[PDB]
Symmetry: C2
Amino acid sequence: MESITSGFLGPLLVLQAGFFLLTKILTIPQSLDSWWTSLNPGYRWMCLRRFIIFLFILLLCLIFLLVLLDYWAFGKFLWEWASARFSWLSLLVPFVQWFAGLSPTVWLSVIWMMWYWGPSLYNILSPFIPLLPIFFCLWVYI
Amino acid sequence: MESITSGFLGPLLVLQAGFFLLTKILTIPQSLDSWWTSLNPGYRWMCLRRFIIFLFILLLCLIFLLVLLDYWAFGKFLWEWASARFSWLSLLVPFVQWFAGLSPTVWLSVIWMMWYWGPSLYNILSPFIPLLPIFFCLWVYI
């Protein structure tokens, strides 16, 4: 008796597991709405936002599953798009190397600045945008 | 020399267009943050949300890169990754095949259907959510 009756059970558990994955997929929009939707006829806008988050859940799973499916050719195909872009990125690497040799002291200094100076850089970026045309004027003068 | 001031002038208008492209990209995270706000220390939360939405913009550009990845062998590579899924997917293929012929003609009608289906499916989903685990348990019994 016990082996057959416990055999039936799990089969409802498989049904429960389907209900748990469905409800978990809907609760992810609810937890995301608490953080994102608080920082930002209501039924359609809730349902569109639930569906857009279901597309984001699907997109994260699709990216994970596609990269798991490749597990070097994808890196090398990205590098073929880089056969042009590397022209530029090959100049960036040497700058990144130099930054890696000085990174300990500079990275901890830049982290401390990113807290005080990061809000300053939001304000200072408003002057950087007008300075970018003045730089051009300097590039044309030079 | 007037000509050198013209020719160099160009770079300056193109450099301004490069700042206009960068600021228009930043308007995509801000306008999605506005749209999310319309459905729903604040400086810190705004900066955190805009950082995460900008990372999501790079993931969305990678999904657009999969559309560009066609520009049948792209579809066939997905069909091989499918081949593991395909034991399950091969039951879906007969359904999708019937849908794939009709739906494009039906699609002009589907635009009208989607308006009336939106309220209908909300009501129908309330009893269908309990029935779908009941029907799943029948699928285990057979």
